[PDB]
């Protein structure tokens, strides 16, 4: 090859396969010794002037160095990296903001040991989208909407590129199904001095929703003691206040609040936590 002191070349091999590795264009009847990570290899592995690896595992990757017999004269350096061909990615999108656009990620079910190249392309019937992304974490299109009730099913496809293989996956959806806001923030419950068997729970609206007055949300409340471990479901209308009368005299409760649009989308996750104590005169 080129000069021995040059930057080594990178070669990729699949898992459990077979591959030979000669150092340069030297003859077959030459004295060749190999070294990995600073230790010598056994002579029972050399096929003349080449090195064959039968059924490579993950613990064979590294720098394959080929030196002269009983010396430190380098001739050819090469880095070996073993990886797995990519599988079909998992794609499922969600609109955190109904008035604005949507966003989604893509990830492989089985992780690989080689960085891949991804592709993004949205159709939306017969059109062209942008998918501009300057986010903190990768794998997020953050597309923006342009119309309302367009009656056109969106179509997005994710592609993966790799030196060992490739795959593709495409899904279809609409703006009415993939709608799920974020759970409410700052869920704090306070007692009431008048009625002992009563609790007051107050929550807020997530700041992600741009128009909380034009597109109202339908809240949900869940209350449960700590020793009873049985949740009772109650549905609420528009409003950030609730008055529960199922509180005990000396027992604690855990409250969880959800969020959902009026008639569009599905339910969201519950709150983080909530703790309160009933009123007691002493």
């Amino acid at each position: 090859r080129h000069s021995p002191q040059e930057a080594p070349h990178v070669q990729y091999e699949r898992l459990g396969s077979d591959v030979t590795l000669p150092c340069g264009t030297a003859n077959w009847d030459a004295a060749v010794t190999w070294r990995v990570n600073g230790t010598d290899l056994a002579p029972d592995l050399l096929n003349g002037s080449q090195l064959v690896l039968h059924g490579l595992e993950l613990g064979h990757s590294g720098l394959y160095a080929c030196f002269h017999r009983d010396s430190w004269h380098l001739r050819h350096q090469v880095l070996l990296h073993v990886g797995l061909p990519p599988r079909e990615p998992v794609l499922s999108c969600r609109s955190n903001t109904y008035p604005k656009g949507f966003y989604c990620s893509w990830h492989l079910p089985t992780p690989t040991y080689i960085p891949n190249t991804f592709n993004v392309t949205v159709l939306h019937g017969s059109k062209i989208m942008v998918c501009e992304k300057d986010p903190a974490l990768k794998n997020r299109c953050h597309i923006r909407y342009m119309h309302l009730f367009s009656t056109i099913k969106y179509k997005v496809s994710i592609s993966v590129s790799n030196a060992l293989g490739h795959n593709a996956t495409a899904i279809t959806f609409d703006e009415f199904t993939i709608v799920k806001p974020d759970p409410p923030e700052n869920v704090v419950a306070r007692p009431v001095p008048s009625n002992p068997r009563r609790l007051e729970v107050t929550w807020q609206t997530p700041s992600t929703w741009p128009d909380p007055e034009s597109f109202p949300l339908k809240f949900f409340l869940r209350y449960r003691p700590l020793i009873l471990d049985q949740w009772q479901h109650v549905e609420l209308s528009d409003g950030t206040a609730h008055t529960i009368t199922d509180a005990y005299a000396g027992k604690e409760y855990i409250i969880q609040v959800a969020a959902k649009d009026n008639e569009i989308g599905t339910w969201s996750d519950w709150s983080v936590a909530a703790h309160a104590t009933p009123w007691t005169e002493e």
Partner: protein
């Protein structure tokens, strides 16, 4: 009663019609054919280009104030009712035709209730005569595939218009009305 119970009745009727239309569209897609039964099936719209669409911008949807919205809903519902009544000749099934007639009667009742809501608020426009050209719309000469495409697009547009009318009724009941 005023606008109190009327808007709630219209909302309940729109929800019931939406459920019935979902069921009827599922049945019609199962009966139409294997290609039309596919989950996505997004072809370019070329057969049906005369029925009114339900695509509007956000600012344009917020600009109208209780009159243009109701007029557009009335005219679109009348057009969709005429199209669904004309669609009865295509299907050949006892239970399917019975469900079609039931949905037609329910949509006519919903149109009448919308007209009554418009007339109850005190708007000097009870029924401004629309169209009268597509008042019957007799079935012209067309192929079977084009007819199935027209039926699918009509069902999709009816679903979209039902969703839009439900959203508009909710907005009117929340913001503009107490």
């Amino acid at each position: 009663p005023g606008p109190g119970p009327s808007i709630q009745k219209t909302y309940d009727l729109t929800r019931y019609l939406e459920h019935q239309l979902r069921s009827l569209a599922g049945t019609y897609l199962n009966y139409l054919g294997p290609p039309f039964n596919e989950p996505d099936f997004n072809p370019p719209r070329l057969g049906a280009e005369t029925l009114p669409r339900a695509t509007v911008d956000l600012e344009v949807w917020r600009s109208l104030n209780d009159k243009l919205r109701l007029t557009q809903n009335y005219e679109a519902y009348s057009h969709l009712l005429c199209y669904l009544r004309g669609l009865n000749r295509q299907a050949a099934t006892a239970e399917l035709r019975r469900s079609l007639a039931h949905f037609c009667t329910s949509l006519q009742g919903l149109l009448g209730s919308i007209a009554g809501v418009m007339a109850a608020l005190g708007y000097p426009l009870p029924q401004p005569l629309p169209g009268t050209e597509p008042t019957w719309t007799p079935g012209p000469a067309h192929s079977d595939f084009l007819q199935k495409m027209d039926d699918f697009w009509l069902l999709k547009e009816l679903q979209t218009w039902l969703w839009r009318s439900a959203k508009d009724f909710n907005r009117l009941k929340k913001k503009m009305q107490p």
